[PDB]
Design a protein around this ligand. Structure first.
Ligand code: CLA
Ligand code: CLA
Ligand code: CLA
Ligand code: CLA
Ligand code: CLA
Ligand code: CLA
Ligand code: CLA
Ligand code: CLA
Ligand code: CLA
Ligand SMILES: CC1=C(/C=C/C(C)=C/C=C/C(C)=C/C=C/C=C(C)/C=C/C=C(C)/C=C/C2=C(C)CCCC2(C)C)C(C)(C)CCC1
Ligand code: SF4
Lengths: 670, 51, 165, 250, 86, 146
């Protein structure tokens, strides 16, 4: 069985694809080898190998994630100031990340504690550890050990399943079994397990810390043995979320444990219900969507939506102790999950297109013109409406006519449904604050919030237009009637019919990545400006609030010039003037590098490969002149690869620019 | 330049700031004519013409 | 039954129980029975919207009427009708008058199915044999049974409001 | 009958599960199951293990076999197979089980709208409720542009009255002079200007495209359209003036 | 309409004919190659211009050359579907 | 070769030759186009195929007939049929007046198969580099068309 696991193919690069068997005649062979590496569908051998590869690769990636978790745990146990952060979280910035004293890189470590200098981490791992009752270094040691053991176990399982599974293997196709066991045993039987963990280790510990005994009598009280504290020790009646814990500025962990217990019960009951529930309508979906790419797209869309829900729920539904006051942590936790939501949504669209090209589509593709046409009209309507309210405000403010602009002190567009959406939270008529820092105050939504929400809707709709147009017009179109034979990813069909560049679903993803990036850059900026202007900030003992941006949002965000001046210029002073400043030197440098990479992408985005091919031939003349012949013949990047490289550099550079801009400012202000 | 027109009054640089933003919009608007190529839009125009 | 067969299998507690415990349909002609159904569905369709409108107004959502009266109108829908500005009521009557005119004279429903105000009969099948469709009779039951419930429900709301608050 | 489907031990697969497999699998595939089909594994094992063959297996081999066979719940029942066999029949017959999009999904309305039009290969004749229903057809036909028996000037007058009456509002309110004591004569002038501009556009259209669907027999081509556009301009003036008169008086 | 020209270097592959999506090309008998056949383009009025024929041609430089003429486009050379020019 | 009597698609509603196809919005746009292309073929079994205008279809055991706006769609369907070993398919262009023009297997033999009586149209008797320089033919019959 395992005697066929041989290294003889390690030296034979490109073995998996039969199109690469001719050998590396040109440099295009290298890029094709890298491109087809994970494309198990088109690789050689039967369908059973596809299942084995997919499952074992999933296990290998799971081992990789476990290794990353183990690295974070070891950094927290042996390369961090988590001790002093535990003792005083409101005066110590989290830091489990040092820099070596080479090339003066020592300037990157900054004062986080009197005994520690390092890079302020914004992953929120310290708050997670405190919410996980991790106090001693031994606990982090054993967490790291368990994560390393999990890495080894998952790696070994990925190794084994390449030969345990065979041609007869069918457990992956049993979707009823997968859904039932997943749902019940994981969402139900593991949620209650975490509820048990919290009830037996957090409530014995986190109340002890909040009770002021950071000593906890060392292990005499902290090491469990506290069955005289009661599970609902400090619920204080009320409703979950209406009253926060005054000490840690978060929801009481007893309520979180009850939530996990009840959610596990609900999931178990739903698994029991699924024995007899509503069906026979999603049944066409049931039979037509049993394929790798469709389920991958469905899961990607679902996980991305969950990621955006997490992004919006991690900030002003504070669960973690001492996390609402840690403003850089809140900002990072929102924005990182926002970006992941966007990226995984785009991936869902791509794999929907791939499923359409490999499998057979459903009924909705036959009236695709009305669908992707009313989508076009709605995109045009909300683009010519949302953005232009900004253009109108801008023009009339430049003209000196502020009474004719869309503002609160002018023609005002009230957010009617949001203002009547006091259902969410429904907190008492005041704010909450822990230590000179605002925990959460209700965002008073006005005209600017209305306009920016419509901008969000417009960008979302345009990205969805690109994605659905790629998906629905994958097999064929009025433009080209045999797009199915062209495959999933192709540069074009030729300069004929006026020009057929970028008709493939791959190119539709290529444009959709740009539009998703543009969509949630505005989301990032809206969050980053709104929180600073209207939520975060200092306090005055006379109940007066001094925010970080001093309420710039409601008065400046009504015009594009307001965004340019009060957000991208005034709030970029921290990152731009960050040279020789200990903590924020890398952020200024990375700001510069992000600008460089973003501009560098334009060389690939704007140019075609024929010019570069001719230039490469001109250079190859000089190489052949001096008897330097590369027998792997130099070829310029393929059209699809040029577009991919351009998109990757564009998004990476822009994301790095925002990343530095937000993080350096929040680190300086805090 | 950015302080030209704001929610505090206007200067004689208001035209300069407005043209600054307009030229930024013009510069970014030409990105789609350079990055996005014909076939996508031809399909889009076919859909609009269908409407 | 003969003529009541045109509205057969569409009422009663169970779908195929011609209730009529007053003889209101016997001796009546086919067109009269169809016209009686057209009255029933029209009452029920309005009753369904009436009940929904009652609840979205008795809970505190009377925006057009709070923004027109410049004050939060009373939650009691009967009392909120009085507070609603007379311009609003007259426009409300006119809009329904235009709709009632539109359906009757310019775009009349057929005479065999006088309740097809949207006119699905020209694209509907209603007589095929597929299971994942042709359940149009079932959805006719859900419209009628829900609407009949809404008719007695909205009267209960009005009677109780006008009497026991 | 087929050799390997007879006397198959219950331990390899149960009787009811095997019958469910045979029902789900198309009849032509029983003799030689394809590959990666549960019936293929059933054949590849029932021809090795049975009464006259190897009657025992290693525990791990039997464990792997039990995870290659169906678990009696992942197979469609008779009613589900009927659902598919009839849904596909509807779809191929040119009829669509009518569904309406909802909150990320669609509700089936339990209606069979015949989908393909009179010209089955025509893309724009696929009949929908909003364009080919009785109400939609009679509403479109009764519009001023389509109403039977209307002289071209009558269509123009009606359309113009509608446009002129409506166009006053966006200017007299939220306009540059919305707060001035007049604030409505400005709106009247702007609405009349919009009516005139669109009428000029219609005249351009009638002098360039020259639609001939309103011309009476033996007339200058496009004369009906030009008359309609001129009377649209007149009706726009009238409707704008009437809206302004109502605003000022009331 | 474009201009599709066939040159003497043709070796009778028939690949260009098979790759054409609008039946512009055809095989005619000849005596200038071992295959005794060369391509021809009798119906370039139907040539959309996809240049698949050029992709399929294996001669050192294409024996079939498609010259794009954008100021010449007809309804067939544009692949018009929603609109008729006849 | 004898051209068939392909009637105008607006006058052949409900024909027995039409394959069972789902029908989509991708079909030819009536009310704006009058030039239609028709492809006919004879099959042996009701094998499912894919329409060039979206949606799938099932052939008839006997004659088949389909209408399309563009010749490209007809040729795509012809290649799809020929992959299923279905020869003897003919593609016609229908003029607005109803004139039937026989297009694809023009001489009855597919263009990839050599047939006598054909002549190399648009043939040039030299290598592609043998074309004259554009600069040489200025203001002649071949001003920008060397
Ligand atoms: C800032 C640059 C910019 C701008 C303005 C646009 C604008 C647009 N893109 Mg686009 N795009 C860009 C960059 C840009 N793109 C880049 C860099 C890419 C990367 C490839 C793309 C990729 C892309 C794709 C892939 C798609 C779009 C789409 C759209 C359209 C949808 C939005 C809409 O209709 O709003 C309206 C347009 C506006 C510009 C809003 C403002 C309008 C002004 C302010 C009001 C009117 C002015 C007034 C009348 C003055 C008159 C003119 C004067 C001479 C008198 C729109 C035309 C989508 C589309 O067309 O679908 C509908 C689509 O599919 N874009
Ligand atoms: C997968 C996640 C991950 C990531 C991103 C990092 C990243 C880092 N680790 Mg690290 N680490 C990880 C997992 C990870 N580790 C795990 C799982 C363990 C436990 C075995 C460790 C144990 C560890 C130690 C003990 C140290 C680091 C150090 C470092 C830093 C410098 C590494 C270096 O010198 O290059 C080495 C490059 C190579 C060996 C090339 C191969 C760097 C930030 C060092 C540090 O921060 O110094 C202050 C340090 O001393 N790590
Ligand atoms: C998501 C993770 C996952 C999943 C779904 C499975 C699923 C499976 N494994 Mg597996 N496995 C995993 C992770 C996983 N494994 C890891 C991480 C390891 C390394 C310790 C193994 C090591 C392993 C072995 C050694 C064997 C299985 C076997 C099996 C099969 C039966 C086991 C059972 O009842 O459960 C089943 C297909 C058994 C099998 O193939 O049955 C024939 C078997 O012999 N697995
Ligand atoms: C009955 C016990 C119970 C308790 C104490 C909680 C408690 C909580 N839930 Mg919860 N939940 C429960 C049952 C419970 N849940 C059940 C049965 C479900 C299934 C429908 C959910 C589904 C659910 C979701 C989907 C979310 C919560 C969230 C929350 C938190 C925010 C509370 C808030 O602002 O409420 C105000 C009133 C809080 C810790 C939110 C959260 O985790 O915030 C980060 C959140 O997004 N819950
Ligand atoms: C669970 C997630 C998941 C999974 C399993 C897959 C799986 C697959 N995808 Mg996919 N995809 C995903 C998410 C996912 N994708 C997302 C989120 C997107 C949106 C961006 C896409 C977009 C996408 C496209 C457009 C295509 C695929 C393709 C494929 C297939 C082959 C991939 C391959 O060989 O690439 C090999 C792997 C690589 C080339 C990785 C190279 C590294 C990337 C490109 C750059 C990342 C830069 C890095 C983040 C920053 C560097 C740090 C810097 C500081 C230096 C395979 C089925 C391809 C296909 O043919 O499908 C059949 C294809 O054309 N996917
Ligand atoms: C506008 C009122 C209205 C009308 C015109 C109809 C009409 C019809 N119903 Mg009907 N129905 C209604 C309301 C109405 N329904 C309500 C509210 C209910 C719920 C109890 C029902 C329950 C019902 C069943 C269960 C069945 C019908 C059936 C029928 C059809 C047979 C004719 C018939 O029963 O008498 C038509 C004439 C009338 C209904 C006269 C209206 C009532 C008179 C005026 C006296 C009622 C006054 C009342 C006592 C006082 C008002 C206040 C009250 C709420 C307390 C016919 C199409 C049968 C059918 O078609 O099945 C195949 C059948 O089986 N109906
Ligand atoms: C039998 C049908 C019916 C009738 C006669 C009325 C009559 C009335 N409604 Mg009403 N309403 C209805 C159904 C109905 N409603 C439904 C189904 C809803 C749920 C959307 C509402 C929601 C509603 C609100 C929110 C308000 C009214 C109000 C009013 C009063 C002023 C007119 C107005 O602004 O309406 C406006 C009605 C709508 C905007 C609803 C449109 C939905 C239609 C029915 C879909 C078709 C008037 C007494 C206003 C008032 O002050 O009440 C006293 C007011 O603010 N209605
Ligand atoms: C620049 C704006 C503008 C334009 C292009 C037109 C254009 C036109 N007007 Mg006009 N009009 C305008 C503003 C404008 N109007 C204003 C502001 C007024 C109010 C004084 C009028 C009052 C007016 C009258 C009273 C009449 C026109 C008529 C006409 C048409 C000759 C032509 C379509 C004539 C018309 O419609 O005859 C066919 C006509 O009798 N106009
Ligand atoms: C039903 C016909 C009608 C009536 C009753 C009025 C009535 C009135 N108009 Mg009037 N008007 C009309 C048609 C009418 N107009 C038309 C068709 C036009 C377009 C030429 C105008 C253009 C017009 C102007 C430009 C002005 C009036 C003004 C007035 C007021 C004096 C008075 C209320 C005057 C007024 O009071 O404005 C505030 C004024 O300045 N009207
Ligand atoms: C919102 C709504 C809607 C819509 C509506 C509409 C669309 C309306 C319109 C309306 C309109 C749009 C109206 C109009 C009217 C008009 C008028 C009423 C006019 C009149 C005029 C006149 C009367 C004139 C006269 C004259 C002339 C003709 C000339 C000379 C002078 C004079 C003045 C004498 C719907 C249903 C969708 C739904 C919901 C609700
Ligand atoms: S592909 Fe080129 S070489 Fe081959 S037959 Fe066609 S024109 Fe001649």
């Amino acid at each position: 069985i395992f005697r066929y696991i041989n290294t003889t193919l390690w030296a034979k690069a490109g073995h998996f694809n039969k199109a690469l068997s001719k050998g590396a005649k040109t440099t295009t062979w290298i890029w094709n080898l890298h491109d087809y590496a994970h494309d198990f569908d088109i690789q050689q051998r039967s369908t059973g190998l596809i299942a084995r590869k997919v499952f074992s690769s999933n296990l290998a990636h799971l081992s990789l994630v476990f290794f990353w978790i183990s690295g974070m745990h070891l950094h927290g146990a042996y390369l961090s100031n988590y001790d002093i952060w535990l003792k005083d979280p409101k005066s110590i910035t989290p830091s489990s990340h040092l820099a070596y004293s080479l090339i003066g890189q020592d300037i990157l470590n900054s004062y986080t504690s009197e005994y520690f200098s390092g890079i302020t981490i914004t992953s929120g791992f310290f708050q997670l550890y405190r919410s996980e009752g991790i106090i001693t270094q031994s606990q982090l040691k054993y967490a790291c050990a368990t994560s390393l053991i999990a890495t080894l176990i998952c790696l070994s399982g990925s190794y084994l399943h390449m030969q345990l599974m065979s041609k007869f293997t069918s457990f992956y196709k049993k979707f009823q079994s997968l859904s039932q066991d997943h749902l019940i045993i994981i969402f139900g039987s593991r949620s209650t397990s975490l509820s048990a963990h919290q009830i037996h280790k957090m409530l014995p510990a986190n109340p002890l810390l909040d009770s002021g005994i950071s000593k906890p009598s060392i292990l005499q009280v902290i090491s469990n043995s506290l069955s005289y504290t009661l599970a609902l020790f400090s619920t204080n009646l009320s409703s979950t979320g209406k009253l926060l814990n005054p000490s840690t500025r978060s929801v009481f962990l007893s309520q979180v444990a009850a939530h996990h217990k009840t959610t596990g019960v609900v999931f178990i009951t739903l698994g029991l219900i699924r024995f007899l529930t509503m069906y026979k309508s999603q049944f066409s979906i049931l039979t037509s969507y049993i394929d790798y790419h469709i389920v991958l797209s469905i899961n990607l869309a679902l996980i991305a939506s969950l990621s955006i829900i997490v992004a919006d729920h991690l900030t002003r539904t504070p669960i973690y102790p001492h996390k609402s006051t840690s403003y850089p942590t809140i900002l990072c936790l929102s924005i990182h999950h926002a970006w992941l939501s966007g990226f995984l949504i785009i991936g869902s669209g791509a794999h929907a297109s791939i499923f359409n090209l490999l499998g057979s589509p459903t009924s909705e593709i036959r009236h695709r013109d009305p669908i992707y046409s009313h989508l076009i009209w709605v995109c045009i309507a909300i683009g010519l409406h949302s953005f232009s309210l900004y253009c109108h405000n801008d023009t009339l403010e430049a003209l000196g006519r502020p009474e004719d602009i869309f503002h609160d002190n002018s023609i005002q567009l009230k957010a009617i449904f949001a203002k009547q959406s006091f259902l969410r939270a429904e907190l008492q008529p005041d704010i909450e604050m822990l230590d000179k820092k605002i925990i959460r105050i209700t965002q008073e939504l006005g005209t600017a919030d209305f306009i920016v929400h419509h901008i969000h809707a417009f960008t979302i709709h345009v990205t969805l237009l690109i994605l659905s147009k790629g998906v629905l017009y994958a097999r064929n179109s009025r433009f080209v009637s045999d797009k199915l034979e062209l495959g999933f990813t192709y540069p074009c069909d030729g300069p004929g019919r006026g020009g057929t560049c970028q008709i493939s679903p791959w190119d539709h993803l290529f444009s959709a990545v740009f539009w998703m990036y543009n969509c949630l850059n505005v989301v990032t900026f809206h969050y980053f400006w709104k929180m600073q202007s209207d939520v975060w900030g200092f306090v005055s003992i006379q109940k007066h609030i001094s925010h970080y941006s001093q309420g710039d949002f409601s008065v400046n965000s009504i015009t594009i010039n307001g965004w340019l001046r009060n957000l991208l210029w005034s709030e970029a002073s921290q990152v731009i003037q960050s040279y020789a400043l200990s903590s924020i030197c890398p952020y200024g440098f990375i700001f510069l590098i992000g600008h460089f990479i973003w501009a560098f992408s334009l060389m690939f985005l704007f140019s075609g490969r024929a010019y570069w091919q001719e230039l490469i031939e001109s250079i190859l003349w000089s190489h052949h002149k001096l008897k330097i012949i590369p027998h792997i013949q130099p070829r310029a990047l393929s059209i699809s690869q040029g577009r991919a490289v351009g998109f990757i550099h564009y998004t990476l550079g822009g994301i790095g620019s925002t990343w530095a801009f937000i993080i350096s400012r929040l680190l300086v202000l805090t | 330049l950015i302080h030209g027109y704001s929610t505090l009054g206007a200067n004689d640089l208001s035209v300069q700031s407005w043209s600054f933003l307009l030229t930024h919009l013009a510069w970014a608007s030409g990105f789609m004519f350079l990055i996005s190529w014909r076939g996508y839009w031809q399909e889009l125009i076919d859909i609009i013409l269908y409407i | 039954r003969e003529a009541p067969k045109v509205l057969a299998g569409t009422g009663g507690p169970l779908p195929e129980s011609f209730w009529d415990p007053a003889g209101f349909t016997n001796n009546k002609t086919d067109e009269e029975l169809l016209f009686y159904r057209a009255a029933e569905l029209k009452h029920g369709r309005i009753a369904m919207a009436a009940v929904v409108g009652w609840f979205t107004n008795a809970s505190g959502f009377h925006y057009l009427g709070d923004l027109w009266l410049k004050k939060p109108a009373s939650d009691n829908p009967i009392e909120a009708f009085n507070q609603l500005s007379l311009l609003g009521v007259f426009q409300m009557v006119f809009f329904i008058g235009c709709l009632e005119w539109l359906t009757t004279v310019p775009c009349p429903p057929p005479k065999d199915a006088p309740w097809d105000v949207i006119g699905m009969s020209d694209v509907l099948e209603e007589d095929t044999d597929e299971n994942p469709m042709a359940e149009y009779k079932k959805i006719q039951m859900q419209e009628l049974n829900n609407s009949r419930l809404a008719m007695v429900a909205i009267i209960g709301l009005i009677v109780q409001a006008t009497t026991t608050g | 009958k087929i050799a390997y489907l007879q006397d198959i031990p219950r331990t390899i697969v149960e009787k009811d599960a095997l019958e469910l497999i045979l029902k789900n699998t198309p009849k032509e595939q029983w003799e030689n199951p394809p590959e990666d089909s549960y019936l293929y594994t059933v054949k590849a094992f029932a021809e090795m293990y049975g009464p006259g063959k190897a009657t025992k297996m290693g525990w791990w081999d039997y464990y792997r076999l039990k995870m290659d066979m169906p678990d009696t719940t992942r197979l469609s029942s008779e009613r589900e197979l009927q659902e598919i066999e009839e849904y596909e029949k509807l779809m191929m017959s040119g009829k669509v089980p009518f569904a309406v999009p909802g909150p990320s999904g669609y509700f089936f309305t339990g209606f069979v709208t015949q989908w393909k039009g009179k010209e089955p290969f025509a893309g724009d004749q696929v009949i929908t409720l909003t364009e080919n229903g009785l109400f939609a057809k009679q509403f479109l036909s009764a519009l001023a542009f389509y109403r039977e028996g209307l002289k071209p000037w009558q269509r123009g007058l009606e359309i113009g009255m509608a446009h002129g009456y409506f166009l006053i509002g966006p200017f007299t309110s939220l306009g540059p002079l919305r707060n001035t004591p007049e604030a409505a004569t400005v709106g009247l002038l702007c609405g009349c200007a919009i009516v005139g501009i669109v009428s000029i556009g219609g005249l351009i259209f009638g002098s360039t495209i020259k639609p001939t669907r309103f011309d009476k027999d033996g007339d200058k081509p496009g004369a009906g359209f030009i008359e309609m556009i001129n009377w649209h301009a007149v009706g726009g003036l009238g409707g704008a003036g009437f809206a302004h008169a109502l605003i000022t008086v009331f | 309409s474009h201009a599709v020209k066939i040159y003497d270097t043709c070796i009778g592959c028939t690949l260009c004919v098979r790759a054409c999506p609008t039946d512009v090309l055809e095989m005619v008998p000849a005596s200038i190659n071992a295959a005794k056949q060369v391509a021809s383009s009798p119906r370039v009025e139907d040539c959309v211009g996809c240049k698949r024929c050029e992709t399929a041609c294996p001669t050192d430089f294409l024996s079939i050359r498609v010259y794009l003429q954008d100021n010449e486009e007809t309804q067939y050379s544009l692949g018009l579907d929603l609109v008729d020019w006849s | 070769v004898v051209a068939e009597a392909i009637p105008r698609p607006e006058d052949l509603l409900d024909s027995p030759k039409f394959p069972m196809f789902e029908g989509s919005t991708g079909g030819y746009m009536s009310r704006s186009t009058r030039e239609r292309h028709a492809i006919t073929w004879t099959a042996k079994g009701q094998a499912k195929f894919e329409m060039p205008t979206g949606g799938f279809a099932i052939m008839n055991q006997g004659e088949n007939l389909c209408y399309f706006r563009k010749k490209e769609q007809c040729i795509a369907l012809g290649k799809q049929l020929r992959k299923m070993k279905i020869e003897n398919y003919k593609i016609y262009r229908l003029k607005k007046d109803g004139t039937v023009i026989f297009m694809h297997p023009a001489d009855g033999v597919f263009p990839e198969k050599v047939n006598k009586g054909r002549v190399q149209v648009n043939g040039r008797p030299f290598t592609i580099r043998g074309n004259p320089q554009q600069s040489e033919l200025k203001f002649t019959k071949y001003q920008g068309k060397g």
